[PDB]
Amino acid sequence: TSYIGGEGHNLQEHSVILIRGGRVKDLPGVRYHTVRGALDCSGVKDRKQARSKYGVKRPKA
Amino acid sequence: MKVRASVKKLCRNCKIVKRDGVIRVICSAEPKHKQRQG
Amino acid sequence: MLQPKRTKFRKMHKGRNRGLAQGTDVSFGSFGLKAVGRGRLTARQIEAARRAMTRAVKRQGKIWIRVFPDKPITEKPLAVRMGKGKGNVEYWVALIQPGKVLYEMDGVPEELAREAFKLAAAKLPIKTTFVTKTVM
Amino acid sequence: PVISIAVEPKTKADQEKMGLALGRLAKEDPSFRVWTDEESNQTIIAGMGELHLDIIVDRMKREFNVEANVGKPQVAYRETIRQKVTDVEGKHAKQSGGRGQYGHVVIDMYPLEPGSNPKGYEFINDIKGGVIPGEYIPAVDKGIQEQLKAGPLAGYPVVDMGIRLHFGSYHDVDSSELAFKLAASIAFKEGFKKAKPVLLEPIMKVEVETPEENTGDVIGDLSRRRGMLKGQESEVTGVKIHAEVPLSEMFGYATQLRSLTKGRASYTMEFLKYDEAPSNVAQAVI
Amino acid sequence: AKKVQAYVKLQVAAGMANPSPPVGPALGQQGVNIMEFCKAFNAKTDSIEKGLPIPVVITVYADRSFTFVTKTPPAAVLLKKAAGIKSGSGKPNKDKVGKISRAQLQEIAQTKAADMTGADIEAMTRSIEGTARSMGLVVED
RNA sequence: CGGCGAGUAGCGCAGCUUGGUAGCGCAACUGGUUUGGGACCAGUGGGUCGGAGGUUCGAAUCCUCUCUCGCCGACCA
RNA sequence: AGCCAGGAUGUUGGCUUAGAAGCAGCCAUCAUUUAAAGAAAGCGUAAUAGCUCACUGGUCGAGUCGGCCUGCGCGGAAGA
């Protein structure tokens, strides 16, 4: 198991993700993070700060 | 062709004949009225 | 099925069926179904004759019923040695002398009336006929 | 993009791999669309015509080893209510866990019209006299809303409602953050059966096309499947059949329509509203 | 009019063009164009009334030229217009809808008696009087 | 299909020998005591005896056949 | 009983405004042109139509039709 943060995802029951570690500790043993930005995980909606986290690319305009 | 024990004149082009002791009913208008017994 | 309220005896002797008619007319109306053969009518047949007499005439008009049971034939169940008493009450039957009218029909022309009774006669085990009205 | 197949490949197992390859088949063309259902937990796959739809899965037969079977939508259809009852009671008096747990609520859920706006479901608070204080106004609504999910008419959610409660009693420390919340549910579960409420169906409208005169060919196959034939749109040659047929009698629709019209049709359909279902066809639901 | 091959009795809606639900393919069973029959008949609604259920008698030759014979309203819907009560029977001998005299009904029976097929003018009015007692209505006398 | 055993309120039972008044213990509900549920200390509402009968001074009671639930045997070859 | 013919004009018969227009459902089943032809008889059109009949011409040209009460029979009636 693994936690997803932000707001807004695209998972339906069988999608490819890549899980990284680092627990969240509000659940006793849900022990990872899904690296949002891994092979189907769409870019999270409208992060204008900390775009390294969550993989959102350069507000060009 | 239906067997019965009661033929009944169903169509109006139903005819009654008695070919060889047996009462046949032949509707030339309709195969679904064709019957014999009686 | 039509069956008596508050009889005197539950169980009745066997009896035979000899003789001729009592009610030999059309009396209440004009069109009737008269018994020519002699046989026994059970009550469900009397229900099923009428129940398949309404939709012949599509519930309209009036139909008069002259007859009724109160010959309770009893019948033993399956697997009995003969006699521990009489059988159990199973089903009402109504004896017929030859010549009694059974159903009387009114409010309809004779034209549908001679056509509505042919569906009735095969709901009775006896033979019947159709009698129209007689004066005096 | 109007013909469709589906998947139920042993009902959970093969679906954990195969749908990603549809997206790997979706870069091939932007016409490779799928319809995701979570009413039925299925993905209904489209195609183009006679040539594409069988080699859609036949490429997945040799290169992916899938076990897909063409399926049908089996849905929840809707539910609605019929009449009202203004005497139920939220009578619980549980004791353990702490100080006390008493509740009491009189639950009156009211029938609104089937043709309504999104104000067709509401929590109309009509409390009086301080029999229930105003620090209960979300949780009495929270106890009410929880029974919408597993409403025991074979388990379907239900709409076109409105609740107008009247009467209750509450103690000092007995009535809690939970006491009305269960009282506004299990008692509201008993306000549910006594209306003889109605099962529904997701009404769609028919737009099957016709060359010039083909009404003498379709007059069976849609009239078995609930057709309310409201006419045509008439042109010089192309005229179109227009009726009203809900979703869940498209069981074998797309693969049997060309069996009828000498092999010449292309249907389209669109979903509008909620109408009711009698118990003869509601018998085939449980 | 030629012999009866694609001869129908039609046009449930005169004032509304393309009667698509009831009629629909009733001209379309031959496949005959409705796009020119409307513009021919929009040119012939200039002198007669509109928005009334007026039928048509349409016959085509073997070379796509078609011919209409339009007429007055029929007698069983004349009660809806000459009396002003857009109603029907339900059960006609046991119904009341309205009452109109024959002296009030005859004002259209000047305009239609040239158009119908009869030999006595007061007897083609009797195609409305006996109609009226058969369609739920009574007539004043 | 057939003995013994009964049906008295939501629940379970004396009233039945030898016909005469429908009570009783614990629930729903409310109050006293306490700061409050529970307990104790006391009450209120709850049936006209599954049902149809006849009988009769009046029927749960007296008898008969049915609805239903128990229970007893349903055996030799 | 046939042999060749009309075998309808009016008008979708207001319904049911279902697709119902001789002819899905309730009922009402007027009459005119008339020598005569049910605002419908069997089908049959998705509904028109198509095809036929009643009711009615010319011809052939002598008996012909449906029930009733009855005689003796046919069907119903398959077993090792």
Would you write up a description of this structure?
Chain A has strands at 19-21, 32-34. By secondary structure, chain A is largely without helices or strands. Chain A has a two-stranded antiparallel ribbon. With 286 residues, chain D is of the alpha+beta class. Chain D has five helices and eight strands; from the N terminus they run βαββαβααβαβββ. In chain D, the strands form two sheets. In chain D, strands 4, 5, 6, 7 and 8 form a five-stranded antiparallel sheet that branches. Chain D has a three-stranded antiparallel sheet with strand order 1-3-2, with no helix packed on it. In chain D, helix 3 runs parallel beside helix 4. The longest helix of chain D is centred in the middle third of the chain and has 12 residues, at 179-190. Chain E has 141 residues and is an alpha+beta fold. In chain E, the strands form two sheets. A three-stranded antiparallel sheet of chain E has the order 1-2-3, with no helix packed on it. Chain E has a two-stranded parallel ribbon with strand order 4-5. In chain E, strand 2 (56-60) and strand 3 (66-68) form a beta hairpin. Chains in contact: A-D, D-E. Chains D and E meet through strand 6 of D and loops of E. Chain E binds two RNA strands through strand 1, helix 1, helix 3 and helix 7.
Sequence-ordered SSE layout with sheet pairings:
This is part of a larger assembly, with chains A (61 residues), B (38 residues), C (136 residues), D (286 residues) and E (141 residues).
Chain A: E1 19-21, E2 32-34
Antiparallel strand pairs in A: 1-2
Chain D: E1 4-5, H1 18-24, E2 34-37, E3 42-46, H2 52-62, E4 79-80, H3 139-145, H4 179-190, E5 198-210, H5 215-218, E6 232-233, E7 239-244, E8 269-276
Antiparallel strand pairs in D: 1-3, 2-3, 4-5, 5-7, 5-8, 6-7
Helix pairs in contact in D: 3-4
Chain E: E1 8-10, H1 25-28, H2 35-41, E2 56-60, E3 66-68, H3 78-82, E4 99-101, H4 102-105, H5 108-111, H6 121-124, H7 126-132, E5 138-140
Parallel strand pairs in E: 4-5
Antiparallel strand pairs in E: 1-2, 2-3
Chain E binds two RNA strands through strand 1, helix 1, helix 3 and helix 7.
Keywords (chain C): Hydroxylation, Methylation, Ribonucleoprotein, Ribosomal protein, RNA-binding, rRNA-binding, tRNA-binding
Family (chain C): Belongs to the universal ribosomal protein uL16 family.
GO molecular function (chain C): rRNA binding; structural constituent of ribosome; tRNA binding
